[PDB]
Paper text:
Holliday junction (HJ) is a four-way structured DNA intermediate in homologous recombination. In bacteria, the HJ-specific binding protein RuvA and the motor protein RuvB together form the RuvAB complex to catalyze HJ branch migration.
Despite that, structural comparisons showed that the overall conformations of RuvB3 and RuvB4 are close to the crystal structure of ADP-bound RuvB, implying that these two DNA-free subunits are probably in ADP-bound state.
Author numbering: 22 to 140, 146 to 338
Amino acid sequence: RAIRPLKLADYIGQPSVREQMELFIHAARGRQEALDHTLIFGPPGLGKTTLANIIAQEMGVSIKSTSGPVLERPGDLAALLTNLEAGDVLFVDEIHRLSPIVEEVLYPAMEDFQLDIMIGRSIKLDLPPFTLVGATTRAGMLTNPLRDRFGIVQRLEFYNVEDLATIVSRSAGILGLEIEPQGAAEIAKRARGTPRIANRLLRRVRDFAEVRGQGDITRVIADKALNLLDVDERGFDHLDRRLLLTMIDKFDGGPVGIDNLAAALSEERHTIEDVLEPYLIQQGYIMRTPRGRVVTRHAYLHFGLNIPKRLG
Ligand SMILES: Nc1ncnc2c1ncn2[C@@H]1O[C@H](COP(=O)(O)OP(=O)(O)O)[C@@H](O)[C@H]1O
């Protein structure tokens, strides 16, 4: 009863990514080689970890999962690399958070299948072929050397509402739930472009339907459930609305720099930049400028506020 895709045939709504990865995986298997190192980037919840695990599943190999911050010293990486079997996937989430010195170990491992680490003497060791799968919230914060060493680069974008409905409908089928097409669309419309949120919202709407309705997912059941969850009709939660209202109230709409906003919210810089902003920017509620972030007129309109008429 698991809803996370395990094979590439169940990876809905990124047709270019799936058609490309199907091809490169089939070719690499055909040669009995490891897949070329693969970089997957885009906002969180889009399916980067999911895709990393599908790669290992379709290649028929093991995946060791790790993260940038988990690797404090070069030897932390070296121990993972020397425990890999030939063809295994080494998945490094948040790969941009590798310290500059730990990332230096990665260049010859990826390029030459060799480990070159200091201990002061340098030691050089042969590594078996393997696939480094890196993921990051967007590729621009990688160094040129690391970025250029990936042979395959996949870009994940926010999903459109029709593909989210398809994912919601498929998950409701796997969960054994009756769902009307308009119920799938109501969740999809308010799921913030993300399959992770759409699936989580489906699980909570199912609870509402089972305790308060008749067990099946309808548009009205979905709406009431999402209202109870405090997710509005654009998919904004309490933090999204607080971000916009802080910019409007405390900063007159902006421009406001990212440090000022993080302080005024008591959130970290990276959660604004990576978790909150990218959907709000894609949908036209916030703009970046060299002087800072500004809200657009659509942020005012969304809350039923008068649009200010001033000068910049
Ligand atoms: N293409 C897709 N089709 C269906 N479900 C997906 C897809 N991509 C991701 N998911 C779902 O989204 C959720 C989170 O995905 P994840 O791989 O953790 O995203 P990321 O690592 O990019 O934050 C999982 O429950 C998975 O079921």
